[PDB]
Amino acid sequence: GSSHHHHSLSKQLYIGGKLITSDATTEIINPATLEIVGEISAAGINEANMALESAQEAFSSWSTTPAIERAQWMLKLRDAVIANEQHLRECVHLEMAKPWQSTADDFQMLVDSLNFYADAIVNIADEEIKDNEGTHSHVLSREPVGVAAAFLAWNFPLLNLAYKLGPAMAAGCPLVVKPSSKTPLSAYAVGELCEQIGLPAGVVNILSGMDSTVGDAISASTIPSVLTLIGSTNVGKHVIATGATSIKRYSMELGGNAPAIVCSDANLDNAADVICGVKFANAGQICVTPNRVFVHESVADEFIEKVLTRAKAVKVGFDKNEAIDMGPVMDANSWQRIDELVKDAQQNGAQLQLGGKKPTGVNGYFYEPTVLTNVDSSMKIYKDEIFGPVISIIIFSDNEQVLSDANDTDAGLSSFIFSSNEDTISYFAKHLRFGEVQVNGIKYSINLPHFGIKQSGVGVDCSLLALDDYLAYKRVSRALKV
Amino acid sequence: MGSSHHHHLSKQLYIGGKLITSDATTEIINPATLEIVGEISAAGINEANMALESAQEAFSSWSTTPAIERAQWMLKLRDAVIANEQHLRECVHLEMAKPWQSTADDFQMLVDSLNFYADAIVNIADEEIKDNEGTHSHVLSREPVGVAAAFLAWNFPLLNLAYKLGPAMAAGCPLVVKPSSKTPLSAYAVGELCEQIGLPAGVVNILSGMDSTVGDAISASTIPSVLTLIGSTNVGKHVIATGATSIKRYSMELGGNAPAIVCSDANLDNAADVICGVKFANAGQICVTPNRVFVHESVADEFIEKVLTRAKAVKVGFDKNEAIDMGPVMDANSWQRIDELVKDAQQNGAQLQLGGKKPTGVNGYFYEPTVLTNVDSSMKIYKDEIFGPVISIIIFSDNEQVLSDANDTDAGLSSFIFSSNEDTISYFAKHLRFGEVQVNGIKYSINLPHFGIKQSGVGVDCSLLALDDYLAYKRVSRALKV
Amino acid sequence: MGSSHHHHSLSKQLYIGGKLITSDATTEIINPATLEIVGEISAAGINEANMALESAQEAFSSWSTTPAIERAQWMLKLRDAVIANEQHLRECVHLEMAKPWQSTADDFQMLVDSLNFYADAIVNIADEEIKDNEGTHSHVLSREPVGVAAAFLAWNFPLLNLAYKLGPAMAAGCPLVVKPSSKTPLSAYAVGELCEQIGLPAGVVNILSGMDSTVGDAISASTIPSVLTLIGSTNVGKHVIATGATSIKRYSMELGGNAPAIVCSDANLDNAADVICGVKFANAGQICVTPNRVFVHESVADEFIEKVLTRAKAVKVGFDKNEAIDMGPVMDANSWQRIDELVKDAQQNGAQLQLGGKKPTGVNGYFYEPTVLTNVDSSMKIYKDEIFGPVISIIIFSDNEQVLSDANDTDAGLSSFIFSSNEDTISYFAKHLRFGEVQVNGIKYSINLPHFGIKQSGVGVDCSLLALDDYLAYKRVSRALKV
Amino acid sequence: SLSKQLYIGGKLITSDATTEIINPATLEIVGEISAAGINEANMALESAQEAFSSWSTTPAIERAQWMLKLRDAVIANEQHLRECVHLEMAKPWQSTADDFQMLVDSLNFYADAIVNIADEEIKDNEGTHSHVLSREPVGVAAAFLAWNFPLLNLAYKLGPAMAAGCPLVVKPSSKTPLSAYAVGELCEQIGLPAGVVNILSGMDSTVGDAISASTIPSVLTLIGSTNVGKHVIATGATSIKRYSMELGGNAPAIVCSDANLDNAADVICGVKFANAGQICVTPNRVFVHESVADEFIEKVLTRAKAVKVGFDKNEAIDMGPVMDANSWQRIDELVKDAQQNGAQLQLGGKKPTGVNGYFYEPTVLTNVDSSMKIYKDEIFGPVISIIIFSDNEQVLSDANDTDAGLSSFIFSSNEDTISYFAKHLRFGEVQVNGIKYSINLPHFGIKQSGVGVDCSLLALDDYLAYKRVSRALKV
């Protein structure tokens, strides 16, 4: 699976504590059935400015609301999320054809984050700093930073929202949320729940619209003190440059290219379950999933056989009342991009062992579980992020050489090492230039920090560190001799 | 101790462990005598690219050099700095016309930072993270980030270098430094000391050149992982946009507009000593020095009299073998900018109590200690950063009203409160929207965090937190069931 | 000819090094009338920009040494492909900025006219012998290709702005790197497709769009270009000059304008209203040479204002290539708000809104109604700044010598207009107006007529033979006669 | 011995600072000038701006009359003008004639050219409009002059600027400011209207940047180094300005096998030793074919031995010292770096015996190749670096292997070798079997050597702006 361990189809914008319409609508098409599943009120530049000014107007009172009272609001919203679980998961199911069991990750992370950051914020304590000369006292404290704006990717609509909504509410930062236009229903539904519980106006705002107009207007605004993004590396560079109209804190999780190293002493059944599980969950559209699977030559044939067995057993389709393991990819551009990487690999010598096409007799953006062997470092599927249900296998023999190959990327999100040797595990854990090194498994949770280095982004999601973006320091220094 | 920092010539480019010349030179003019006092080899984009490429090649060896061993290099450099104290302070004296005693801030902060961060990096310890499900173990560690680049302001040529050099060396990031072309001599002298001790090539690089070409080439390069800047908010925003060729970490200290509030129950002698001390130290060219002095009407006549007495006793001039309190400002642009702020205030009702002109019979960029009263929120001197030896006084009546006036700025660096009332102190310390609140005094040191909020920048200089920009996290998670 | 220029798309890839290529990025194109996506381009990064610069550099020795006859042959082969794809090229301009269908002809036709004019001009370039006063040497003065050229194009005339640089650069054998505005890149990307179709030699023409602070700065800061040319604002003009200082480069640019249009007591009021209204509402007033300050004499003020209001009311506003539309919307919301602030600022300082000054009722896009303001004075923002919109700003004057000082009271120096029947008055204003162009009782621009500004409006000349000067470098060969 | 004041706003004024001028041959003080500060630079710029409306509207016939009046005073003060040059940089008396004569030639050439400027009619293809193309003064001009030719460099800018009605702000090099200050005294003596010509010297970083960064100048012109040119471009970006520059060169001189070796040695040695080789168009790399190598080296050695080096107004001195200690050390390190990589020093390469002045002997280097810094960088000194070649196509590739693009030299008697090199040499000027420069011949560089043209009618282009007047014929 994803290894994220837990702890009215017409919707309007949620701006300024009210549900409002606009001058335009957006029809949402299910990527499996290609049928319209709903519509949202689409935001324009005028609606973006309304959300920003409403968030700014709320900052003074929301940031001075005691932390215990802000937590009370977070738990009241949590209780409404729990009471409306079925509709929230149905929104994600419809907008992106995510399997019904897979929608539990989105819903439950929303509950977990609300719980985690409501509990963490009431435990924040001031810190005293020693004065080496004995002349002054020093108290270090943390205060809300300002208005925050969040651009969410479509792969996990409610989980991505949970990563930002939790810390912002807890840290008293009025939040402007732009869900992806491909998956807005579930976020708009959260906005309906905020309106239902009577959340103070401006504290949370949810609006979707076109990127080059609404997205740029949020970035170029001088109101936001923090701009946070989950998306592509090129969009991250666009947000940084566009947000330069003022001084802003940036934090983003961008593209990855995770190497997975399976050694000769590795538990092959466990390595196969872990890799296939996360490579086919959400159809491989996962930031931390393996992108290049390196396998030792001595266990290559046996490991490929174990991978094919699991890949053939993946249940593909779109049916909430069946045990579907994997759905389609997001849209047509994603399908053709994945297919171009797979076909280019074959044309350069890679061997297709399974999949590599759309299931016959279907029209949605389905791509079959794919297994590619004989992949080398000169191929485009090696250099680029697949973000799809494709297992690409590279054969290695020297631990020192495969370490250099694993590091031969600008990405810096996750990485995997499967081995039974303690010196081998220690060797790769220290030298892998990645934010996360998963040993003999994979584990993510609201209390564990999730982050990338290098060109995979800035900042941390989950854990107490996620509050860093939304809290600013203050040093009060007083002379003791008055 | 007026500046509040509490302690604890033809020069070539230093690039890739070697001292090299170029095709051009830059003359350095003393701002007091208007005479040439030195020359440096000016860098072009070719020299900028050499420093970047040499720092990139050094990252593999320097980042994997043991922290104890990197600290030994920092102490070796510190030993050469101490042995060259006179020449280093002479460079600051010549390029800035700083009084001899005021060059101690530059020199001693360089020693203090090398000591503090050599000691800090060897005490960095890993952090265990608890797994709530008991299925995995989690180890959080910190590693070098990559190449760092630093753009330094001219007001503290060696102290500004100290804030970046200490953390970057300790954290194993090769550093590319661009001192201001107005004050490059003292930094170039540090490059000579680096070469003298045999520092590995690329670990430190010093080069000065045009902002439009050399500065942009450094920001636009894809090599730097961290961009740090001490400067103006316009250069800040420019660096963020031009750096958007890659994902970079940004650390900045920009404009300040510090309010200093002298209440009815304040120690007037102490308040006048602190305010006057830092307002005339370095000719008021200090990021944390008060910009707007608010004084309660009940003690305004007495406090203004104490300010004028101190301001009249300031000895202005330039001579290393004389006892001089205050030197001139940096250049003609600064002189005219300061003078326009004073004249504009006079044209709108401000009363010139002292100064407001160049002293008699001198040609350098000297500006007399200036005192203005009857200043209001509409004047340019209220809205903009003086960065000069001008005390601008506003009379207030209500503590809750003056708090709103104090916060009526986008700056977020330092602030000051002078009061003997514990409730008044707690009220201002909590509600002042600034990174630092100085109560009944002023205190800065290498162990105390120095940071600004809002449009005054992002990041922390000094204290352990200054390492955060140069260190990247890593989570190693291992399945315990194996 | 309302614009005064007298004639003689789902997904597009980058045209770099003679190949159509994709990138890791993608830029959507929004129509400013419908606010819907109409197109898609592969966005360039600094890597693609350096690929274009390097391919253009590699092509210089081969392209610059290609005979002028053969280069003009390639220019006519491109021209034939332009004519064969006129429909698609104009639909690209129509879609990217909602320009009325007839107004798209200025873009398309100037592309044809420039390819013809400079293909013919380059083959008539002859050497010039220089006399030696001492009889000791011979002197031959010739002209050669200067190097690689880079062009930054504005959005107001996507293909016409391309035409001004593509013609001369191809003819003079300078490999060209073109950066269209990211607001209107569709039309130029289509020309790149045509270049690839006819098999133009690699590196001779390169077309790419991307962010200004990254892609645009990478082109200017490159040491490869010998000539940097720009059609844009005064602020980006100064930015390009400073950023290009990494090497010695020729600069040529057309920047902001602030044209005065003086309607005297003896002017043909019908002719003056037709000319001023025609160019003020063509392309929604987004024209560098259009009047910005309309000065009208006291005795003819009321009569001229009524004639202006009659024409402004007749302007048909909308967006449909299969309807009769005079005027479309402005480019984006920033321009709309910028124009609206100028109109409201004037009202707050005493100007009288006679017509328009708002978006038309019940419409979606960035439409701004044809606007007429009277009682405008020199203190207003609308007097000091460039409107670049469909606003006629009228100032009443009484003295010809005073209105001459008022007209010259600007740092702009593009076009200017004088309407009068008095020959002495015409000679007085044409001599004393400090502008690059003085238009008397009309307005006229064409591929053979030089178009240029002075003062802070820019340097260099577009159109006419003089436009070649930026792409050609002189050479003097001097030989001692005494063997 | 002489004290010269600033010429600003039609007045001779003093300032708070002074600069002493030291002769580079005797190392003795020869005079002083009132040094300009930023305030004096603003004064000159504002006075030039103030004069623009009256001076640019002064008839071209009347402007030419002021140029000839200045010319008359220049002729009457020839001895003193050439004495300043002789004293400020120890230029030999015979060589100072080029500085003085170019000043009188430029005043004459451009006072006559401006009164013959005629409007041009442009044809309207449609017959609906008439079009007249005229030229008008651009605005205030500022000129930064190098020290190698103090008066000749001034002449290149003063003539066109006065003729085109552009008030001019002149910053002579602080190393050679005396001769130009003397011109300013003549400008004050004849009663030239205030602001039309302004002369001031000062610190490059303060006074030079204050002129470039000011928004008043419409034209920034410079004769100097390539690095200074890039600095002026970026610094002047505070407004839109016209730039015209003559920067560094690296002229290749190709001595083929069928060349007149006597004539080639005369031309090359003559210009390589005049002004101590401190000439923008002097050969920097001398390419000689193998068949004529040792015969040409011998002839070059003969003329280089006959060079009379010294500093004496009453002696027929051929060559003085170089400008300062920086230039001497820079030239010496180029020769010793070439020797350290295999260059055979044949003559000179040292300071003459017991001189102590900044003298560098006439130097001849052989066995120079493309690796050496003396091959890549501009010598700007009395050094002849010879490179042996064999094939014409290969040495043409070597000749163009530079970012410079000023002058070039081809010596050959074959008509096809002449046409082959004259076409493929990527330089602004190709001198064939000789060298010629005059006020009427255009002087310019391409590539990294600058933009714009000095001398000839094309020099007026930087100071004149076009205007198209178009009228509707049907009214």
Numbering used by the authors:
A (entry chain B): -20 to -14, 1 to 475
B (entry chain D): -21 to -14, 2 to 475
C (entry chain C): -21 to -14, 1 to 475
D (entry chain A): 1 to 475
Question: Could you pull the original sentences from the published paper?
Answer:
The first step in processing the free DA monosaccharide that would result from complete depolymerization of carrageenan is performed by a 3,6-anhydro-d-galactose dehydrogenase, which is putatively encoded by the dauA gene (locus tag EU509_08920 in PS47) in the CarPUL of Pseudoalteromonas sp.33. Recombinant DauA displayed activity on DA when using NADP+ as a co-factor. Thus, the enzyme(s) associated with this activity remain(s) to be uncovered in Pseudoaltermonas sp. However, the PS47 CarPUL does encode an active NADP+ dependent 3,6-anhydro-d-galactose dehydrogenase (DauA) that would initiate cytoplasmic processing of free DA.
